[PDB]
Design a protein around this nucleic acid. Structure first.
Ligand SMILES: [Zn+2]
Ligand SMILES: [Zn+2]
Lengths: 442, 57, 69, 108, 85, 63, 121, 286, 147, 57, 49, 196
RNA sequence: GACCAGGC
DNA sequence: AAGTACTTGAGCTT
DNA sequence: AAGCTCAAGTACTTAAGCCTGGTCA
């Protein structure tokens, strides 16, 4: 039977703790949010910000300077790319003049009825001729809201005795955002288990085509940058198993035997070794697999080499991804296999992807034959939680993309008007960026 | 014991005879702006059901 | 927030017995049982007022706009 | 029960290749083995050549961190065995005929 | 009923009274049969052997399902003999 | 060479077409260009027995 | 196309081939000095006072019931000791198949629950 | 999707959800359920897996549900037999707990799924990634705190109390059986005597109370702020009412209450208040 | 039972045992049309009855050496209208809506369930109360506010 | 409301003298009708009563 | 019946959506009406009257 | 609400006869000898394959519900009213049950006697894929407690597994009370519109 | 008017 | 998603 | 050849009554 603790209480009220808070469990229940938002800038490798903005790579556009050689020469080349992303703690100068700035505490931002924001900064790398000459420069994308009690807020590490001095709640746990005076926070969502290949049965797999059955294999994959990609395998009644992905609010369909040979140079005797293995006795297998192989031949009479497959991919897929006119389709075919198929294994993951995608297929036929039961998608067994900060870090990575895209668009419009264009002029750049609309924060 | 919200001071009101809706010249929706209460589809069958109509009209 | 001046049900004035209850708890290191019963609180009515009370005002006073830090 | 160990070879002698089941190569075929000293682990690469086929093979970087492989010669008219260290190489057979076949960069 | 007008309800039924003299064992006699009967009911397993292919069908013991589903070797041959193929 | 109606060249790995659709007495891969005689075999019987999933019954609804 | 750091294995040591003799494949943990052992069973064994388990993984590398279903092919030094040939015994050049494949792997133990200390009224 | 599934024992609170249209959709984690925001070190997992007898995946072709599968985070490390994978998933479990093997933190899940008849496709899984659910237990062979995930839970035997543990059956036990509830399902006194929909309604009402919103009230600009003038620490108390420190925020007031039919205004859901309690300050608010 | 088939020497590998599994389960040996199955219910309330799923009257009419043809009642509204006419349907509807409220122990005076039933059959056929039956009414403003 | 999930409305402020006064002189604060319990099945309130009195004494 | 404008933004509801949906115009402002001379409040038991 | 010092003894006597119940329902469905022990393997296989179907488990649950519901009316009719400590009229709770003023016999017997079987869609506790009804039970448990049958009572308390079962039966109620009203809520608008 | 709340 | 009523096409009969 | 019931397949609509507020483009 517990007690009231009348003395120890008034001891706490009168003199608040000067070392660490007295209620450890109250500060450990909010850990989901602070952990996520701290995970952005911290971590040995630079967090989600510095790794994510690296994923975008380069954006390419061409000037068309003839050089006076019909000429396949497209002119001096422009490579726009970001490098790192940094976030500065909340700071406010007094008006103009850039006098030595002072900190802004939350209790000032609740009363003033504006947001509590730390600054955002980009290091934008501007290159020509693929690394002969380049320009390092820094810019300003505006103010970025910042979680309280985290590494980018000043209240981090203060002891409860100094949470009072700055006019806060003694135990205050923060863990939310101040938007225009309101306290807004992100709430947790339940998505599918990352990096696991669920076996599915849904009626909606049936209506997508004539011969589609309701069996299927679904994998949701996620990169070191926490961005996600969805990959599905549908089983047609006539034995064809199709690969499916979703891009820019579109859906596409590709035969799987294409991608298997696309990943690593291979010949079908090894595929049959991979799927069936030592099970050659069973008749339900060799039949389905032979109707699977035969289908790729005589559908596309000429593909004798991995490269001839890659280029065939590049022809159809050159348009959507908006690749630069210089890249040979051979390359773009390699852009796909990095940017879509089974992305969580990296850009060197060809050899491992070739195993994973086989293992799925085996587990799909084992689902058709009834040897294994379909995973229950409603249950908590297959589910995880998607934290607030890990949502807040995907979006910024998407907006930097739309930013670079917007610059590239501005230069292209600068071309077709016909104005003089010189890419070795830094002052030309400082002329360019202002015309573009740069505020990410707002 | 715990006291809750939903004090009656928040919930009650009377008439519509303040301002009226502009389109249909009807009682405006209300409380904060002092509008009326809504007769309704099923409430319309309680009128007819008794046979009472002068009270319906 | 602060000590109530009258016990609700009984009506006796329990408002002056909080300080001395703290003193009795502190100096002589008694328990809650004998401390309440020494002040002359008999009914289980008037005992719950002092026994369970919370001074939250001590936390309010810490925030004073009218003095320097 | 009990088996005595006559000899144990520490040096490159034989090698082991997994190609596929029922694998064989023409009579002449001959395989060149190669070796690198990375840390205190030994990596191996295999390259074979005949008139119309190539053969290549590598040691699995991941398994060789925790698996050591050894070929044994057994004398059952004795309680004896002769162990030789051997790498296991993951290997393929490539047809010289179709290796370099290739379509155009794009069928535009 | 009310809302639909539906000509095909989910689970229709009929209701059959019977004479008094008909016994309770004759109850199990008359209507057990005269039900929808698929050939898939009497088939224990199928073997397919492959250019041509062969079909084997190993049924149950005739005496067994002769008493239950009330079908005899004669009709069973005729139905397979025509509409199946 | 032969597994369950699948027959593959010993050099390259491509899938051999119908042995009967090849006119010459030697099947030749489209890659390695290796040669096989036509008939070492009749087409294999493909032993096939399938699951108990489908059908209802009297006995399996008992046993 | 030799990669960086590899040198061709010049002088290949000798491999004496041939109730007749048998050829085995054996996996040991990489941390085990094989050069100093003595025993070997035909269950359990200890090497350097630490204990391991020997498993007959022959049915994984090959088929027990049917011939020519072997994953692995043995390569022995050729008549120059500067290259390798597929090891055969059949006077038919039919590749040698391993007679047995053994996996020497580590084993673990668990401690019993003390129900006196743990199952309390 | 609105049913209460038994696979959620110990993570999602059974009792506490708001009813109405949201009922069943919103959930709250059991107050000991933690969510991991860090990427654990997977570097040295493969070598240990190899020294436990896992054959390399890069070679030695094999496949089929007939034999075990061992994976990490979406890479296939190796294939081993089922009763091998049980010796592994048991051993690796223990080396995780005792802590004498480096590069193998306790947060890692070990998910071994035994092959069965027409159940889930078997395998052995290792998940070190972000945003996974974890709850503590007490590992029986030793006595220590351990971490169990939602995926490795369904196949392992977790006893509720040390009195109920069967010999040769249970490999784990809860710290305390209250670890399965949420914060506000603990703050109900004797929640096991009441009927369950009543516990749920309580969980909802307790969030509508007129409480102490904060001590900062003079510096805070919020639009509408309810506060109660006088609180009291309740007499009937849960021990978790001390740890989270609700006493900095007293939610209500004790009362001397009699169960009787006397007045005649108090029937069904109505109640009566002594008139000299109010005028003396009982229930006041701002 | 054993027999053989043959096809073209040049053919595909097309799946067979699936075809067999498909044709075996449509293999209608003997089907008295629309009948499904029989169950002998309990001798309830002194009445002795048989019940079969599916509705076929013209088939049940030949069994009268066994089951009586005058007391055959149905759970369908329409099929009784195809045979016995609007009157046996109007009488059926009441006995269907009754048996829903009889199992809940509730009670609804038949003066209501008669007015509904007579309000459906006013056209000689069986009309719903939804959009499709209200189509034939005279007044617009009733229909115009419905859907 | 209580912590056991009894939501209720103050009906009338009842004079102090008309409350039934205990043997000891304590008028109750809040009267609650028994007939509410056997439908709602709350025994935690009956038990919290005793645990409250024995605690206050 | 109107072709898309910027594929989104919602259409500006037309005169046929004035009287052709959910509440529309025939069942909002006719089959029921907000009314003068009406009140609303909480109820409390009185055994006396 | 209290039983006598005698009546509780009866209660514990007639409940102890339900310790072995579930297995006897496991034998009659699986077609074995009535004495087949609980952990026997070939028993476990039949208990295993029977699960993957919805219909078969729907049969087994209706088989056990008969027995675990029989035990209930064996206990209650023997215990209350003659096991009560205060006899009606002196006892108020029964005066509320008997007089029909509020509540009914079931609500009193749940306080004074036992909860009885839990029912979700007419069946027993929804079974996880691994054959465990809840993480604390051995896989494929023949026992009666593994179907949600609760021997506890709101007066003396209910064990953790019991409470976690009763939460389900509590939620199903609220859900269905949400789905009912709208359904008949729409139907009635069709009738009154045409019969207006 | 669109999204979260909340009451029977 | 559940369900109805409406509508277009190629086989089949005079 | 041409007619007309045949069949599957392609569009189209509704889905309980209230009251409170809350921020926002
Ligand atoms: Zn008092
Ligand atoms: Zn070939």
């Amino acid at each position: 039977t517990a007690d009231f603790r009348t003395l120890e209480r008034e001891s706490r009220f009168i003199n608040p703790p000067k070392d660490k808070s007295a209620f450890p469990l109250l500060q450990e229940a909010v850990q989901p949010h602070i952990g996520s938002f701290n995970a952005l800038t911290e971590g040995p490798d630079g967090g989600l910000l510095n790794l994510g903005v690296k994923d975008i790579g380069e954006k390419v556009i061409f000037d068309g300077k003839p050089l006076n050689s019909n000429s396949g020469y497209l002119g001096n080349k422009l490579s726009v790319s970001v490098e790192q992303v940094s976030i500065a703690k909340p700071m406010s100068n007094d008006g103009v003049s850039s006098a030595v700035e002072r900190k802004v505490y939350p209790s000032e931002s609740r009363q003033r009825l504006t947001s509590y924001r730390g600054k955002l900064l980009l290091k934008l790398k501007w290159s020509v001729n693929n690394g002969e000459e380049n320009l390092f420069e820094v810019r300003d994308c505006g103010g970025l809201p910042v979680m309280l009690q985290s590494n980018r807020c000043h209240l981090n590490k203060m002891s409860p005795y100094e949470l009072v001095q700055h006019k806060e709640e003694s135990d205050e746990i923060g863990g939310y955002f101040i938007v225009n005076g309101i306290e807004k926070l992100i709430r947790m969502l339940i998505v599918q288990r990352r990096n696991h290949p669920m076996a599915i049965i849904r009626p909606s797999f049936a209506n997508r085509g004539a011969s589609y059955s309701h069996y299927g294999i679904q994998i949701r994959s996620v990169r070191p940058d926490q961005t996600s990609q969805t990959n599905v395998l549908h089983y047609l009644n006539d034995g064809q198993v199709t690969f499916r992905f979703s891009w820019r609010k579109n859906e596409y369909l590709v035969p799987v035997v294409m991608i298997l040979k696309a990943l690593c140079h291979t010949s079908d005797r090894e595929i049959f070794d991979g799927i069936i293995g030592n099970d050659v006795k069973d008749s339900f297998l060799t039949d389905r697999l032979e109707l699977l192989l035969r289908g790729f031949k005589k559908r596309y009479p000429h593909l004798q080499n991995r490269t001839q497959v890659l280029q065939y991919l590049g022809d159809k897929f050159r348009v959507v991804f908006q690749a630069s006119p210089d890249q040979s389709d051979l390359e773009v075919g390699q852009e796909v296999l990095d940017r879509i198929v089974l992305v969580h294994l990296g850009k060197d993951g060809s050899q491992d992807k070739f195993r994973m995608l086989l293992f799925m297929i085996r587990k799909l036929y084992s689902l058709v034959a009834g040897e294994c039961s379909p995973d229950n998608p409603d249950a908590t067994q297959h589910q995880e939680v998607l934290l607030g900060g890990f949502l807040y870090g995907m979006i910024l990575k998407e907006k930097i993309d739309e930013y670079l895209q917007n610059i590239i668009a501005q230069v292209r419009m600068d071309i077709n008007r016909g104005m003089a264009i010189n890419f070795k002029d830094k002052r030309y750049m400082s002329r360019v960026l202002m015309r573009v609309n740069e505020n990410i924060g707002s | 014991y715990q006291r809750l919200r939903h004090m009656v001071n928040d919930k009650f009101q009377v008439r519509s005879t303040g301002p009226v809706n502009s389109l249909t010249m009807q009682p405006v929706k209300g409380r904060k702006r002092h509008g009326g209460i809504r007769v309704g589809e099923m409430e319309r069958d309680a009128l007819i059901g008794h046979g009472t109509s002068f009270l319906l009209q | 927030m602060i000590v109530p001046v009258r016990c609700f049900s009984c009506g006796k004035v329990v408002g002056d017995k909080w300080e001395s209850y703290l003193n009795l708890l502190q100096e002589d290191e008694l328990d809650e049982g004998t401390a309440l019963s020494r002040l002359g609180l008999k009914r289980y009515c008037c005992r719950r007022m002092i026994l369970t009370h919370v001074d939250l005002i001590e936390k309010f006073l810490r925030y004073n706009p009218l003095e320097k830090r | 029960s009990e088996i005595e160990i006559e000899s144990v070879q520490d040096q490159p002698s034989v090698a082991v290749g997994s190609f596929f089941k029922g694998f064989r190569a023409p009579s002449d075929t001959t395989f060149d083995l190669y070796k690198k000293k990375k840390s205190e682990k030994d990596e191996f690469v295999l390259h074979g050549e005949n008139e119309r086929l190539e053969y290549e093979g590598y040691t699995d970087s991941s398994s060789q961190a925790s698996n050591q492989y050894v070929v044994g010669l057994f004398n059952p008219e004795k309680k004896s065995i002769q162990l030789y260290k051997a790498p296991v190489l993951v290997s393929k057979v490539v047809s010289k005929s179709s290796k370099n076949l290739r379509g155009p960069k794009i069928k535009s | 009923i009310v809302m639909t007008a539906s000509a095909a309800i989910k689970t229709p039924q009929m209701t059959l009274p019977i004479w008094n003299d008909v016994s309770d064992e004759q109850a199990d006699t008359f209507c057990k049969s005269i039900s929808k009967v698929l050939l898939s009911e009497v088939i224990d397993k199928v073997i397919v052997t492959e250019r041509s292919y062969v079909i084997h069908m190993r049924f149950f013991d005739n005496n067994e399902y002769s008493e239950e589903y009330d079908v005899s070797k004669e009709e069973l041959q005729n139905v397979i003999s025509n509409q199946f193929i | 060479s032969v597994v369950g109606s699948l027959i593959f060249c010993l050099d390259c790995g491509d899938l051999l077409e119908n042995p009967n659709a090849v006119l010459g007495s030697n099947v030749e891969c489209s890659q390695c260009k290796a040669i096989y005689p036509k008939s070492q075999f009749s087409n294999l019987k493909v032993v096939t027995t399938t699951a108990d999933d489908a059908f209802p019954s009297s006995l399996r609804a008992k046993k | 196309s030799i990669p960086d750091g590899f040198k061709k294995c010049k002088h290949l040591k000798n491999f004496p081939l041939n109730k007749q003799q048998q050829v085995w494949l054996i996996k040991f943990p990489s941390n085990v000095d094989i050069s100093k052992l003595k025993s070997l069973p035909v269950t359990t064994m200890t090497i350097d006072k630490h204990d391991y388990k020997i498993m007959d993984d022959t049915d994984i590398e090959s088929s027990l019931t049917q011939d020519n279903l072997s994953n692995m092919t043995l390569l022995v030094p050729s008549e120059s000791k500067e290259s390798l040939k597929i090891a055969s015994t059949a006077k038919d050049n039919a590749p040698l198949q391993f007679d047995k494949v053994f996996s020497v792997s580590e084993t673990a133990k668990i401690p019993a629950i003390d129900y006196s200390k743990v199952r309390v009224p | 999707v609105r049913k209460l599934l038994p696979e959620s024992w110990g993570f999602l609170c059974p009792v506490h959800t708001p009813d109405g249209s949201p009922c069943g959709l919103l959930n709250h984690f059991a107050h000991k359920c933690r969510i991991s925001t860090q990427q654990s070190d997977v570097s040295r997992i493969p070598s240990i897996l190899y020294s436990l007898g896992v054959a390399p995946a890069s070679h030695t072709f094999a496949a089929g549900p007939s034999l075990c599968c061992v994976q990490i985070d979406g890479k296939i490390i190796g294939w081993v037999s089922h009763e091998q994978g049980k010796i592994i998933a048991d051993t690796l479990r223990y080396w995780k707990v005792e802590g004498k093997t480096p590069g193998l933190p306790i947060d890692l899940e070990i998910g071994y799924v035994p092959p069965s008849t027409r159940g889930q496709y078997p395998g052995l899984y290792l998940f070190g990634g972000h945003s996974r659910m974890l709850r503590p237990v007490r590992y029986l062979p030793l006595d220590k705190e351990d971490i169990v995930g939602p995926f490795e839970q369904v196949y392992m035997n977790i006893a509720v109390t040390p009195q109920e543990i069967q010999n040769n059956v249970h490999t784990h036990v809860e710290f305390t059986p209250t670890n399965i509830l949420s914060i506000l399902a603990n703050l109900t006194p004797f929640s096991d005597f009441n009927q369950s929909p009543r516990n749920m309604y309580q969980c909802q009402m307790g969030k509508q109370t007129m409480g102490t919103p904060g001590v900062a009230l003079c510096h805070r600009s919020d639009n509408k702020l309810y506060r109660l003038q006088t609180g009291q620490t309740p007499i009937v108390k849960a021990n978790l009412y001390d740890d989270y420190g609700m006493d900095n925020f007293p939610n209500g007031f004790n009362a001397v209450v009699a169960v009787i039919s006397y007045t005649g205004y108090d029937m069904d859901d109505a109640m009566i208040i002594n008139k000299s309690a109010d005028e003396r300050g009982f229930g006041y608010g701002t | 039972c054993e027999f053989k088939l043959e096809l073209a020497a040049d053919t595909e590998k097309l799946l067979m045992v699936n075809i067999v599994e498909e044709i075996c389960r449509k293999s209608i040996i003997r089907q008295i049309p629309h009948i499904d199955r029989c169950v002998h219910p309990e001798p309830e309330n002194g009445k002795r009855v048989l019940v079969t799923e599916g509705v076929n009257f013209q088939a049940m009419w030949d069994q009268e050496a066994f089951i009586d043809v005058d007391g055959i009642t149905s759970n369908d509204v329409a099929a009784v209208l195809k045979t016995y006419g609007v009157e046996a349907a109007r009488n059926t509807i009441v006995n269907e809506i009754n048996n829903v409220f009889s199992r809940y122990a509730i009670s609804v005076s038949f003066r209501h369930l008669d007015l509904i039933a007579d309000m459906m059959t006013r056209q000689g056929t069986y009309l719903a109360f939804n959009r499709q039956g209200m189509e034939t009414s005279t007044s617009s403003f009733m229909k115009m506010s419905y859907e | 409301s209580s912590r056991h999930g009894q939501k209720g409305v103050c009906s009338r402020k009842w004079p102090t003298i008309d409350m039934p006064f205990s043997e000891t002189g304590i008028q109750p604060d809040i009267i609650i009708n028994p007939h509410a319990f056997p439908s709602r099945m709350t025994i935690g309130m009956f038990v919290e009563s005793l645990a409250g009195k024995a605690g206050a004494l | 019946k109107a072709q898309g404008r910027t594929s989104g933004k919602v259409p500006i509801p037309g005169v046929k959506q004035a009287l052709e949906k959910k509440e529309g115009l025939f069942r909002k402002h006719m089959m029921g009406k907000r009314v003068n001379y009406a009140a609303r409040s909480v109820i409390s038991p009185d055994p006396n009257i | 609400l209290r039983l006598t010092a005698e009546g509780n003894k009866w209660r514990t006597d007639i409940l102890k006869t339900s310790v072995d119940t579930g297995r006897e329902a496991a034998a009659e469905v699986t077609n074995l000898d009535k004495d087949t022990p609980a952990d026997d393997p070939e028993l476990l296989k039949r208990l295993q394959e029977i699960l993957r179907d919805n219909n078969k488990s729907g049969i087994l649950d209706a088989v056990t519900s008969s027995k675990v519901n029989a035990i209930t009316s064996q206990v209650v009719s023997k215990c209350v009213p003659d096991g009560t400590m205060k006899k009606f009229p002196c006892n108020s709770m029964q005066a509320m049950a008997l007089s029909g003023a509020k509540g009914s016999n079931v609500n009193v017997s749940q306080i004074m006697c036992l909860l009885g079987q839990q029912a979700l869609e007419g069946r027993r506790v929804p079974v996880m894929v691994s054959g465990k009804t809840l993480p604390s039970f051995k896989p494929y448990e023949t026992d009666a407690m593994a179907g949600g049958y609760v021997k506890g009572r709101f007066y003396s308390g209910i064990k953790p597994q019991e409470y976690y079962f009763h939460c389900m039966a509590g939620r199903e109620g609220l859900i269905d009370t949400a789905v009912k009203t709208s359904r008949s809520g729409y139907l009635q608008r069709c009738l009154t519109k045409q019969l207006e």
